[PDB]
Amino acid sequence: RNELEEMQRRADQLADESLESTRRMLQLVEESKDAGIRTLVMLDEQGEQLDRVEEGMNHINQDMKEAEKNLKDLG
Amino acid sequence: SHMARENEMDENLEQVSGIIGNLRHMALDMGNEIDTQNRQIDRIMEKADSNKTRIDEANQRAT
Amino acid sequence: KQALSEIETRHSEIIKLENSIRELHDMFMDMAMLVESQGEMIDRIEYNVEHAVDYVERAVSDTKKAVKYQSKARRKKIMIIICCVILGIIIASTIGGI
Amino acid sequence: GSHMRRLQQTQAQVDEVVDIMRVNVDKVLERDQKLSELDDRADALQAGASQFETSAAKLKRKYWWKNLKMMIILGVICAIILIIIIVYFST
Ligand SMILES: NCC(=O)NCC(=O)NCC(=O)O
């Protein structure tokens, strides 16, 4: 029964190869989750940075509106 | 053994499925967020265009 | 021969899954890469603005002072003239006395 | 047997998340342009603010100076009026 032996040897071969790519998948997906969270946290920190930058233009706008008032009192 | 080999590669393949469940969830927020940050920057550049016009004008009136 | 035909079918697709997962892995890896790369470009924007705000804030107070001093010097210019009107009156009050 | 729906399900999920991330990179790719354009106006503002900064400090010194001269001149002219008011009143 070598006919079936080499047909069931290359069948227990496909067995490990599949559980191995299942080990590998599990990892690639794990990293994708880490790398994903890092991205989400960054956007959260940079989200605040832009929040600050917007307060900036607001402040600047109110001030330039004042320095406007002033330079009018200077002809 | 190999009957457990399957039983294991199926048990953790199960995880793959679930974590991919998270990934989608996440990618949806990661998008809806950048959809707001690209909205912010578009606005900020408008306010910051008003202020360079506000300053270029005032800075040339001092002369 | 039957059990084999149904395994070569699973194995075949289980890899179609893996190769499609790596693709999703990079989508997530390159994501964190671009967001980290833009993160520093934001620090300069924030920097230059928090400076631009500082500058304008200083510049605005100065103007406020400039108008104050002007309004001071304006009052004095008047006092002075008043005094000179007084002197002209004095000078004319002598020449007006032979 | 369910070991084929599981693949038709999990693979369905993945395709979807990848279809999502294609879009998400297009949104990040724009955030790079929108963001790169703002880095320019941020620098092209701290500059004009540092310029108007100096132009404001100048007008301040100019009128503090202008003010100073007045007080001095007032000082002398008021001293004069004083001298006079004294000689024609000191017996
Ligand atoms: N009101 C006076 C003022 O705002 N600053 C006075 C000052 O610190 N001047 C610095 C200098 O004389 O160089």
Ligand SMILES: NCC(=O)NCC(=O)NCC(=O)O
């Ligand atoms: N011009 C006001 C004056 O009487 N002296 C000028 C002066 O001391 N300036 C300095 C300051 O205002 O602190």
